[PDB]
Amino acid sequence: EQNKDIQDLLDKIVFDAQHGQIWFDENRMLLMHTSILGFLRKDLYQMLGLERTKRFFIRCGYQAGMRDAEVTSKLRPNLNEAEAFMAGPQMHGIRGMVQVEVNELHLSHDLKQFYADFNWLNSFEAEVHLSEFGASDQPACWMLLGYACGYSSFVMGQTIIYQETHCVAQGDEHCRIIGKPLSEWENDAVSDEIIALQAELN
Amino acid sequence: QNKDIQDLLDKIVFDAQHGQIWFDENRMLLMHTSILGFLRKDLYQMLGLERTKRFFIRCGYQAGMRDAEVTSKLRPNLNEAEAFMAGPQMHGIRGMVQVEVNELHLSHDLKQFYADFNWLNSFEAEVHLSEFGASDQPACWMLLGYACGYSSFVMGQTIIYQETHCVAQGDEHCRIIGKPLSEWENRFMSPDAVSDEIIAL
Numbered sequence: 101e102q103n104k105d106i107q108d109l110l111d112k113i114v115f116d117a118q119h120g121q122i123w124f125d126e127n128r129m130l131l132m133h134t135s136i137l138g139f140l141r142k143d144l145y146q147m148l149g150l151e152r153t154k155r156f157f158i159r160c161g162y163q164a165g166m167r168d169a170e171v172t173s174k175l176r177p178n179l180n181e182a183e184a185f186m187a188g189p190q191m192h193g194i195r196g197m198v199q200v201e202v203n204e205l206h207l208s209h210d211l212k213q214f215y216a217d218f219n220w221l222n223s224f225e226a227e228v229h230l231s232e233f234g235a236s237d238q239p240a241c242w243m244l245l246g247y248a249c250g251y252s253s254f255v256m257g258q259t260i261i262y263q264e265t266h267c268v269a270q271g272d273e274h275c276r277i278i279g280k281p282l283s284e285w286e287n288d289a290v291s292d293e294i295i296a297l298q299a300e301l302n
Numbered sequence: 303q304n305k306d307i308q309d310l311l312d313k314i315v316f317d318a319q320h321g322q323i324w325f326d327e328n329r330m331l332l333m334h335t336s337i338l339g340f341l342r343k344d345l346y347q348m349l350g351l352e353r354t355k356r357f358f359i360r361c362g363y364q365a366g367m368r369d370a371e372v373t374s375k376l377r378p379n380l381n382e383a384e385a386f387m388a389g390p391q392m393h394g395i396r397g398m399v400q401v402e403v404n405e406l407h408l409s410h411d412l413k414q415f416y417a418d419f420n421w422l423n424s425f426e427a428e429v430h431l432s433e434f435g436a437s438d439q440p441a442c443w444m445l446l447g448y449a450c451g452y453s454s455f456v457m458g459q460t461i462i463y464q465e466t467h468c469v470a471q472g473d474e475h476c477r478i479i480g481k482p483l484s485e486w487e488n489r490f491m492s493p494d495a496v497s498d499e500i501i502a503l
């Protein structure tokens with residue numbers, strides 16, 4: 101009943117248990133335990149730095165988001181930009197990663213304007229960071245954030261960068277993101293700009 | 303309709319508008335294969351083949367061992383084998399590989415185990431080819447770790463598997479044999495040891 105706005109995404113998702121395949125369009129997916137991701141995060145933290153691991157998860161996110169945008173934009177072009185755009189927050193929820201709540205969204209491909217202010221509820225990534233590292237000094241939703249940048253940059257024609265302003269792992273009540281184009285942030289690896297940015301803010 | 307996997311499927315709840323997927327009390331993610339692709343490339347160049355192979359067997363091991371935890375108490379009025387089959391069934395459910403049984407016998411009590419399985423549609427084989435191309439050896443490291451983690455848990459002893467054929471080498475399907483440590487021709491600290499056994503093959 102309650103899937104009017106996501107059904108077109110769901111119709112692309114095909115479970116084939118008997119042949120060991122899950123498909124989103126012509127792309128295989130895997131059902132995985134969030135706790136195995138936390139294990140992976142920690143083992144990567146141990147082998148490489150905090151920085152390399154961070155950067156691993158952002159670049160991964162970034163590819164996943166770009167890939168999903170490739171898929172979700174080939175279809176849904178009878179709609180206006182905002183309804184089209186919303187596939188990305190919908191895919192994040194459909195994949196089990198985070199619930200997106202929109203505070204603000206303004207965008208125009210042709211004006212090269214973008215500004216997003218979303219809340220992130222029940223982020224899996226924050227959960228597993230607390231589980232492996234305990235309370236954090238910095239925002240923890242690295243993979244989710246690269247996905248946001250990747251999805252959003254593909255859909256716009258340009259580098260959109262997000263910042264996680266509040267994070268459940270830091271003890272905030274929910275997580276929160278803000279997305280603008282690169283140069284709107286005063287003052288390839290766009291993962292270095294995301295990482296560099298979070299240091300310049302406080 | 304048509305399922306001997308329904309007791310497993312029942313436990314999976316998708317809740318997309320709260321951003322959640324569940325298996326029993328445990329939370330899950332539908333992921334891209336790209337993450338594992340990257341991990342595999344990144345580690346190949348940062349760490350070399352041997353360390354990248356072990357890392358993947360280790361991650362598969364931990365997952366297999368976690369499915370075995372969750373599925374353990376679930377089939378008491380079925381025999382040891384029909385219960386064990388959760389592992390192979392879960393692998394298929396999760397979009398990883400399809401398991402066709404050639405042979406399977408096991409006794410916990412007699413400490414006996416032989417498994418000969420075909421692996422069809424291995425996501426891992428596909429990811430190896432698309433990043434490194436043809437292998438010279440079996441490449442389904444994660445899948446193999448899982449087999450070892452799950453089976454070793456259930457049998458309460460070290461079960462090691464050999465991938466005898468692999469789509470990554472140009473064979474038409476992947477194949478594995480699992481037996482106990484002993485039968486081969488030669489908590490946490492024990493997993494590291496088990497993972498190292500199943501890497502020297």
Ligand SMILES: Oc1cccc(Cl)c1
Binds near residue numbers: 187252
């Ligand atoms: O969760 C998010 C946030 C912004 C954009 C997208 Cl595509 C997903």
Ligand SMILES: Oc1cccc(Cl)c1
Binds near residue numbers: 393399401450452
């Ligand atoms: O795919 C497999 C193969 C053997 C055991 C398990 Cl639990 C899964």
Ligand SMILES: [Zn+2]
Binds near residue numbers: 223240264268
């Ligand atoms: Zn967060």
Ligand SMILES: [Zn+2]
Binds near residue numbers: 465470477
């Ligand atoms: Zn293989």
